[PDB]
From a paper:
Microtubule (MT) filaments, composed of α/β-tubulin dimers, are fundamental to cellular architecture, function and organismal development. They are nucleated from MT organizing centers by the evolutionarily conserved γ-tubulin ring complex (γTuRC). Here we used cryo-electron tomography to determine the structure of the native γTuRC capping the minus end of a MT in the context of enriched budding yeast spindles.
We reconstructed the native yeast MT lattice to 6.6 Å resolution. Three-dimensional (3D) classification of the MT subtomogram volumes against 11–16 PF reference structures revealed that the native MT lattice contains almost exclusively 13 PFs (97%) consistent with γTuRC presenting 13 γ-tubulin molecules for MT nucleation. This is in contrast with yeast MTs nucleated in vitro using recombinant α/β-tubulin, where a highly variable PF number is observed, with 14 PFs being the most abundant, although in agreement with native yeast α/β-tubulin MTs nucleation in vitro. The native yeast MT lattice is in a partially compacted state compared to structures of yeast MT reconstituted in vitro, suggesting that the native nucleotide state as well as MAPs result in a well-defined MT lattice spacing in cells.
Numbering used by the authors:
A (entry chain E): 1 to 440
B (entry chain Q), C (entry chain Z): 1 to 427
Amino acid sequence: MREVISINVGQAGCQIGNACWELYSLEHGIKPDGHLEDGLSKPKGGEEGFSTFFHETGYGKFVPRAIYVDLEPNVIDEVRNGPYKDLFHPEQLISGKEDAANNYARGHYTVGREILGDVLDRIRKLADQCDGLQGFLFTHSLGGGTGSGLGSLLLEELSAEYGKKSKLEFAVYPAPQVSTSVVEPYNTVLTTHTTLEHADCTFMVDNEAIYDMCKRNLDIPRPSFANLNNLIAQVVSSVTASLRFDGSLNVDLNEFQTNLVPYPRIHFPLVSYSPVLSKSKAFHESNSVSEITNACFEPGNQMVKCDPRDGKYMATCLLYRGDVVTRDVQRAVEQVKNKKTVQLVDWCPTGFKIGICYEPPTATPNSQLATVDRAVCMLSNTTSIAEAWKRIDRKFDLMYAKRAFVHWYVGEGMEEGEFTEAREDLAALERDYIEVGADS
Amino acid sequence: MREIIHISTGQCGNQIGAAFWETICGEHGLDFNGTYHGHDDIQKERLNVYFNEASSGKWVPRSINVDLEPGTIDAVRNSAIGNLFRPDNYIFGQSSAGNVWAKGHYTEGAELVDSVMDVIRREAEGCDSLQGFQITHSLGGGTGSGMGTLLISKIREEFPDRMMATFSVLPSPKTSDTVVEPYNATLSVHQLVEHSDETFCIDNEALYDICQRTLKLNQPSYGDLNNLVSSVMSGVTTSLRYPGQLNSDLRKLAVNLVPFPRLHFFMVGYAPLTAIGSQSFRSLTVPELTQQMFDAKNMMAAADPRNGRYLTVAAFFRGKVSVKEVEDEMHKVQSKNSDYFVEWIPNNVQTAVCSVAPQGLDMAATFIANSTSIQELFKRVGDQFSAMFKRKAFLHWYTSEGMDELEFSEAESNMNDLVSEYQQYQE
Amino acid sequence: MREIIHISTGQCGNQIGAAFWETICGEHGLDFNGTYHGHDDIQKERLNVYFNEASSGKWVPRSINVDLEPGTIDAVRNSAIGNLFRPDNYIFGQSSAGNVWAKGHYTEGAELVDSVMDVIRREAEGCDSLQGFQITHSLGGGTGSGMGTLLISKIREEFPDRMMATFSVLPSPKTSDTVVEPYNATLSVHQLVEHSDETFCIDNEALYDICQRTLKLNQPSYGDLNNLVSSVMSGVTTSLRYPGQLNSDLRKLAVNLVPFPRLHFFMVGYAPLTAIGSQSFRSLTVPELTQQMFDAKNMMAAADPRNGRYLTVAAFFRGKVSVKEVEDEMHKVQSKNSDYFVEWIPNNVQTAVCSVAPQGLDMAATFIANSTSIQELFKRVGDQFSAMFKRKAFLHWYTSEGMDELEFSEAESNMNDLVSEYQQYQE
């Protein structure tokens, strides 16, 4: 109950991982090659953590404990020819050599599970290497079939092997406006059932919203995927805020599923990060936490193309970094309640989890986010993505009228029954989304 | 799983393959005397796809060129870069296929093709990551249509898990070099549809039109047309051999672009279509390439796109491009061109990103799509048969070897079935 | 126990032995005037196998060449390197054996062979570590088949503990230089099977085929064929005269390759089979040599290997080679070629490693195996007898000296027994 293992699947997941370990090296003072250069704190390991994500080598080196699994060797080569070679163990970089699809056509079938044995053996050896195990971090793209298929397969495998560890999945969802490839909705929904049956906490991120805030908040005319990776890297690394730094009231990973999820039911909270400003707008804004919370409530900063204020209230967590005052945040949340926001349920009935962290918020030099003395990361399991899955499901109905793909899907061994079961599972999930707020 | 073996056959196929070879050796950089010019790493592991390491640091192609006339190889080894070709790659015989289908592969074309199959096998165990098979031939040509289909038959027989890529040149229904050119074309497509997974529609008259429109070419030369088609052929695989946001593979084309293996006909479009004298006056950007993509006079099918409708379209972009430009332009085209897209996908789009810039240019792309305009060409050819071939004039030259009217009736039924498939899927 | 005495007889045998001599003197290095050129030590103690130290630091061969025509030695002492041959080595008479078997050794061939046996004895006490006996002759030739078998008889009589190696050239069943060439061949093998421990199948037509396939030789010359067979002959003993992972000896061939002394017929294969103009385009590696080994057009039996099956195969590798490459390729061939191996060994393999590289090449090997394809040649020769010799035409030339039909019937029974042995051991 000490270490967290992170696995990235797909090119997008690998880029996100690269960005996030670059940050981790940045705040914790590890040079882009490690050992050291030099150690900083007190507390960064020792005392623990680290080790929480970086293995503490006996020689004094710091080694990230991650497994790069992919069937496209280009990403592994790009990782290995850069400064990342000194951070990842050679045996942890599982480079694939078979390319027949990208990738869900064969990824979620017999083609992938003769390699999964080696992956499970390696992760078991890594778990035996460390003392204890707390949870897993997942970073895969639901657009790319590699991420969907391989990540889902690992999900059922590691839910079977332990079944007692927290499962955090940062899945990149396809843009609801347009899809880069047609098969992405299949790659998402044919694994949504496995996610429902084999996940504990899933985080939804949309590239369209990140691009929107880059165009608007960052004033960037041509946003890049690297900027998105860096932004979601801060989002991930602020969660994950009190687990590596001292705080007055630290937040535990189990606490999330104790308070946000009181049922064997919906466990898919939203995330938001704020303030979001450029280096040129830092000379005019010194706002308090109330406006930061208001920015979090904005649809554009929710990483979902929907209105979070049109939904119904659900238990939420507020995490604070830097210089914050409890009276100020209590006043802010009381004002938010006074403004008659999303309809409060009668089961909590009003629960605002407040997290305070001493460390100042940090920003990436590769990104245009200005360093701020206080930041808010808000987690809420709001039912406002229900219309998002409804739009995806309408797309599903219209492209399932002809079924458009069942030729290959049946030819490899599947049949329309699985698609119908996924359809009715999604319908049941939407109905539960409506009912959980309709009961109150 | 990247290596590609380039098979060349036919009179036009040899020229197309040769021009593709010079375009490849110029785009990655390799002098003909065996001098390394890659810069720096990505141009070294990716040349294993087409070349194999010989002794003393020499790179030689893995490509079997076959033709019944041996005069083309003389204009290859002594001409521009073909000196890397090992002498064993020259499989040639005597003297011709007769420019017909009855003698192309039915009786005399099945003799040396056993040795061709043997050398394909030996290259197969000589290869480690065999990915796909590239063939360039002529639909109406006697040699290309003759043993090309039978080579496809063997490559399916020995490789049931490997897809096949065909780039036959479709003769125009208005130009008749010989009276039996459409006859050979249809006798070839009789088995092409039953043995191929995807194909491209190439018309020389469309190339002439685009040369006289944008290039303003004064001398009709097949070399420039070969250069254009070879640039397109390189562009469709730059995504595989150069990583981007979304790498694309031929199997990905089969999964996404192809609706089902029966329907695999594609029209090809290329951009930018600019000539000398206009390079200092245009801004080469993603939107301009897009209006050049959907322009009705830029594809080489060549048919009318705005009188029918598309079933699915794809974009294969190359060079330093931001993710926002391409998606924003795709929103624009889906908003303004929504009528001609099918109402069941409903977003006909497949995107691929390439890192390196095209040779001789800054930004470029290729266009692959499915429309209902190919059935018009099919019915034109069928009407040509129903008009000319009802007199049974010069038809004995094929029935002398044992041809029956059942095969021709079955081919007519096949083209009827293709039209019906093109109407399912209504125009 | 290394010294080898090379016996030469017959018209073709003299040329083969001479060419073997130039190949030997070039592979270890020795000029014809008596100049030391070994580098440095291993090339000095190993030349005692073929040469003996004369006065003033001179090395002379220990080889008895015998032939009834004295014109071949004139084209040896005055031609390329044969000047080291001591004058006593020239045992020649007058004038010919008649190109037949009745006069080869039955009546007139038994006169000077007593002196030959005496000089063999005197060389025997002149030798200290006599190991084996190499003989080169022609199966259908009058001289080689004539006194070759009788020399084998004496060498068995006087050396009951020394094995015998024979490399007779088997005439093809389709080429008939003379009407009685197969007749002499069978009259020789009548005692060859009863007096030899191992033999190699050599066919000149296979050499012509491999020359016209890979060498593209324009002039039919016996010198190049002699060079090839002499390189093979040197390669089969490089393992003995140069240490490796597993040194191989002729007795080791008898123990492992030979299933029993009755069956001792082997087909020979050599690699690499490359010519000038392809040296700068291939990678000479163990796997390529392996596909050249099991290739159906590379052995010189010459028969069809994939229509029958092997009983046991062997590999004799030369040059700087790692242990992993050869064993990995052997796993590959045993996995893909498992059907044609016998199901009772079950791993038909014998490996030998040589240190020094072959002359004129980098890496090379020899192929020795047992298959069921030699019984086809035997039945072809038997059918030729049963067709031509039932007329008793020109048959009196042999019965005039006291030949009986019992010997021919016994030879037919012997070839029937050989076929039955080749079917035990089913095809």
